[PDB]
Amino acid sequence: EEGGDVDDLLDMI
Structure with missing residues (x-):
């Protein structure tokens, strides 16, 4: 759940 x-x-967005 990092910036990556x-x-x-x-x-995804």
Whole structure:
């Protein structure tokens, strides 16, 4: 749940 996950969430979004 790091910034990469946020980037993945950004990728998800």
